[PDB]
Amino acid sequence: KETAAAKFERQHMDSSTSAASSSNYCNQMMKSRNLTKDRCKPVNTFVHESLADVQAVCSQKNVACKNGQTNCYQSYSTMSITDCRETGSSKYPNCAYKTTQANKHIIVACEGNPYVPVHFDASVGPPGKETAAAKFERQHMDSSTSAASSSNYCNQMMKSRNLTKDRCKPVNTFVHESLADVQAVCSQKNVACKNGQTNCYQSYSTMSITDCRETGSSKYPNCAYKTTQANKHIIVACEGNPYVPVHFDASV
């Protein structure tokens, strides 16, 4: 019995190759993945990224699924993908496909514990624009993992969350807790923010966090960071309706 997560890998994952080289790619891949067994599946997308990279998308930009569900996620980075579209002259069982390569952001539906991709929803071309709450999640939320695995966490994460694009962002914290726990902080201990405003809140509880701080020798575009893992209360500024985090003020 194939799990939903496994069916997604079969139908949509192709890590073991960087892109759709040949124009016959789809022809071969659609066949080997059993997508032409009962019929020539009209269209399909393959993602040429590591499983972990695609799996991390489940902790990225939350967006509305095409089907009306809320469990879809758009990747912060563009990915190598291949769209396969059946040709007009394709006849089963010799299904024929036009192979199309692109670099785009992907949108997947995620499910389960662990929380992994179970459907491919769409692809989105460059670029896009961001809400305060969305930006907070990109810069400061890492729900996927329980903590840092090494001291290379920050080098990887700072880059993949686009925090080293124009310059090296010097200091930035990531919170390894659920979104609901972090959002709940907006209703916890009210405190003043560093800037003197009073829409800041300190979590009642310590949380698993990671402090990314650029090294003193680091220089753009070669941004180097030290990774420090810790358990501290966070302090966030909250705004809007719903009343959610929009700035990471400090941890204490």
Binding residues for substrate: 7, 10, 41-45, 66, 85, 135, 138, 169-173, 194, 213
Helix (H, G, I), strand (E, B) or coil at 188: coil
- In the numeric block, the tokens 């299904």 are attached to 95
Q: Closest approach of Cβ 74 to Cl ion, in Å?
A: 23
Per CB under 5 A, 210 contacts Cl ion = no
Q: Closest approach of Cβ 173 to Cl ion, in Å?
A: 4
Q: How many residues bind Cl ion (CB under 5 A)?
A: 3
| Token reading at 24 | 């016959």
Q: What are the residues whose beta carbons fall under 8 Å from the beta carbon of 152, sequence distance 6 or more? A: 227
Between CA 81 and CA 210 the distance in angstroms is 31
Per CB under 5 A, 120 contacts Cl ion = no
Query: Of the residues 48, 105, 140, 233, which is catalytic?
Result: 140
Q: Closest approach of Cβ 247 to Cl ion, in Å?
A: 9
What is the β-pairing status of strands 189-191 and 171-175?
A: unpaired
Judged by beta carbon, residue 82 or residue 172, the one nearer Cl ion is: 172
Q: Choose the stretch contacting Cl ion; rule: CB under 5 A; options: 75-83, 103-111, 146-154, 242-250.
A: 242-250
Q: Closest approach of Cβ 211 to Cl ion, in Å?
A: 8
DSSP 192: -
Per CB under 5 A, 227 contacts Cl ion = no
Which residues does the annotation place in the binding site? 7, 10, 41-45, 66, 85, 135, 138, 169-173, 194, 213
Q: Closest approach of Cβ 212 to Cl ion, in Å?
A: 8
Judged by beta carbon, residue 57 or residue 212, the one nearer Cl ion is: 212
Query: Of the residues 48, 105, 176, 247, which is catalytic?
Result: 247
Question: Among this protein's residues, is 119 annotated catalytic?
Answer: yes
Give me the residue whose beta carbon is nearest to Cl ion.
173
| Residue 140 CA to its chain's centroid (Å) | 13
Per CB under 5 A, 248 contacts Cl ion = yes
Terminal-residue alpha carbon distance, the chain: 48
As a dihedral over the C-alpha atoms of residue 193, residue 199, residue 203, residue 209, rounded to 10 degrees, the angle is -60
Write out the DSSP string of 118-166. EEEEEEE-S-----HHHHHHHHHB--SSSS-SSS-HHHHHHHHTTTTSS
Which residues in the 144-203 window bind Cl ion by CB under 5 A? Answer: 172-173
Query: Of the residues 12, 48, 105, 233, which is catalytic?
Result: 12
Between CA 29 and CA 100 the distance in angstroms is 13
Q: Closest Cα partner for 156 from 76, 233, 231, 251? A: 76
Question: Among this protein's residues, is 105 annotated catalytic?
Answer: no
Enzyme catalytic residues: 12, 119, 140, 247
Instruction: Give contact residues for Cl ion (rule: CB under 5 A).
Output: 172-173, 248
